[model samples]
Target: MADTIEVDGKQFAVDEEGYLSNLNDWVPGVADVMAKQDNLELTEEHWDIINFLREYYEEYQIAPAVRVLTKAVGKKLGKEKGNSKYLYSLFPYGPAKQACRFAGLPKPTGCV
Candidate 1:
């Protein structure tokens, strides 16, 4: 069934897994409400990753693999920050899956 989510008074379509049906419907509130659903908050650190993933999709036109993100983030931020330690510490639920979802992106390959 196609479901809808109300975020900041606006409605957006979501799928069974609670991911937005179309990226075009996404707004920053999408992440806010989605994080709230998880009993979480969208901190600036989290926002950084979300924005990074969104831009990644724009430039690459493909959902990124975790290792791909790890490597890329590592290059941009630094070696330690790129590894799972920093990424997972910020998003323990799996950076590619959780962050990408918050970023209103298609699920990454091999994510589960």
Candidate 2:
């Protein structure tokens, strides 16, 4: 079963872990709503990751795991920003899980 959240006069479905149930229903402001639930303030750097994840999912049809995300970010965004600590700083709940949620992606396989 899924949960529902009303955003901007619209309803979106989310899974138990709070990931979007339908990727197509996502909008940019959805990230702010989801982040508020986690007590996070979405920043430009956050958008960078979320946007990247969305594009990656579009290409691969699956969310990348943390290690894969890190390497890919390193390749595209530069090695300085690709480390776990930097990502963790932006997404304290865990990058692969939390960032994917904000990106409106299903939970990555093998994630807790």
Candidate 3:
């Protein structure tokens, strides 16, 4: 398939791997559409992780590791929501890659 995503004609470019091609091209709908493509419904918990990744990406300019994600969530948000299990549970396809894709960040270096 071509590298692109569209929601009701609100189209955006993506990488061959289905990641948003440009960070500036992101909007909430982008993830909504991508989630739909993946058969994933948007949930508040998903938003939590996606939002966190976007924030971390702008600051770090890279996708986060599971360790970093957990530590940050635990340290900043709290332990109740701060574990890889929660992440992998929410994003069963692949947490790091899926989270970054939904967050409209670049494809994570080590994720496949």
Candidate 4:
């Protein structure tokens, strides 16, 4: 286990800027901690999106653009989960961007 910081009762391993360290460090049963901290319900949809982003980051070392992320998510999880409209509703800053941040990934390039 990595050094973890507790925030609002949820434990997350973060860097100095307060972001996740690595996807592998998250304990299997700690999903609830993540959900509670993010104020989200740990549904299949949430897991789907987060897992997808983590995998993508592992492969690319970069977060996907919101548009690409939505398309991929929709393709993987169906339209309801993939639409930009719904994704933004879940994360007003955009799903890929926000989820990556929440997952403790570096900020995507080209974002202001």
Candidate 5:
């Protein structure tokens, strides 16, 4: 059975790992709720990556893996923003997995 999170009085189902079961149910504050569960605070910088991930998934219809995310971010943002070191600093739990969860996307393949 899946778990759930309540956002603005609406409940959205999530997998055991906390990825949203229905992508369409995601709302603006979803990331804040999810991040709170992990005891992490969401900041504007975090939102930058989260929003970018959503856009990338919308365009590609799939979440990028770490390697692809790094390259793509670098290509779009800049070399300083593209590397795993920078990503891990922002998402210490693992960029591909944690950031995607916060972004309300499915977990990337080969993550666990």
Candidate 6:
């Protein structure tokens, strides 16, 4: 099993620097921290969403727009997992933004 944690090799908090060391910079063998925080299980479906957020941010240097992310996720994971409502329900701070932060990516441009 893989570890899902909230720290880096240097033991810095994932969300500390505002940017992650990498997409998979999550704890060495515990990727469930985020899931636990959200009261959800770590399933393939959840991986799909988190992976998308990781990849999108890696490529674009910015979090995906909520609407764009919703449409994309919906297209891939179906309506139940997609849509702004579901996305926000999963991540009140906004999926694209929150997921990225959880993944340890840089904060969205305008994030306070």
| Candidates by TM-score, descending order | 2, 5, 1, 3, 4, 6
Local distance difference test, candidate 6 = 0.59
State the lDDT of candidate 4 residue by residue for 20-99, as single tens digits. Answer: 67555654344455446667664676677777777787887768777678778877886456776788777764577667
Better of 1 and 4 by lDDT: 1
Instruction: List runs of model 3 lying over 4 Å from the truth.
Output: 110-112
Give the Cα lDDT of each candidate: 0.78, 0.84, 0.79, 0.65, 0.82, 0.59
TM-score of each: 0.86, 0.89, 0.84, 0.67, 0.88, 0.58
Q: What would the per-residue lDDT of candidate 6 be over residues 55-104, giving only the tens digit for each residue?
A: 77668776766667787887777745576677766777566776665555
What lDDT is reached at residue 49 by model 5?
Answer: 78
Q: Over the full model, what C-alpha lDDT does candidate 3 score relative to the true structure?
A: 0.79
Selected candidate, larger lDDT, 2 vs 3: 2
| Backbone clashes, candidate 3 | 0
Across 34-83, the per-residue lDDT of candidate 2 in tens digits comes to 88888987888888889999998998776789988888888888756798
Best by TM-score: 2
lDDT ranking, best first:
2, 5, 3, 1, 4, 6
- What residue pairs clash in candidate 3, if any at all? none
Model 1 CA lDDT for position 68? 80
Q: How far off is residue 45 in model 2, in Å?
A: 0.8
lDDT of 3 by residue, 25-96 (tens): 588898988899899876988887789898888887767877677777777666567777877788889887
Residue-wise C-alpha lDDT for candidate 1, range 1-112, written one tens digit per residue: 8777887777787776867767775788888888888766678878887888888887878777787888877776655678778777887788778888888876567535
**Candidate 2 displacement at residue 28 in angstroms:** 1.3
